[PDB]
């Protein structure tokens, strides 16, 4: 699903090759969905756990 979201983000720019920015945005969307799916007792811990992958 991360791979299709990156491919769709590359398709939105009409670029036939996927860049690393599209991977970063796809990972950001999937991580944000997983954090929003989690209960609020652990949303801060889960946000700080994956913050190195989305922000950089």
């Amino acid at each position: 699903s991360i791979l299709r979201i990156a491919e769709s983000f590359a398709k939105m720019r009409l670029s036939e090759f996927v860049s690393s920015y599209d991977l970063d945005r796809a990972i950001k969307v999937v991580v944000d969905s997983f954090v929003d799916a989690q209960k609020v007792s652990v949303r801060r811990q889960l946000r700080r756990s994956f913050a190195i992958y989305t922000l950089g």
Partner: peptide
């Protein structure tokens, strides 16, 4: 304060195919 599993009436396989789940 509750997790996603008992918030929905959906089961694990029907939830598992869905790529993005916007709460």
């Amino acid at each position: 304060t509750l997790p996603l599993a008992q918030n929905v009436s959906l089961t694990e396989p029907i939830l598992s195919r869905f790529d993005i789940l916007c709460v």
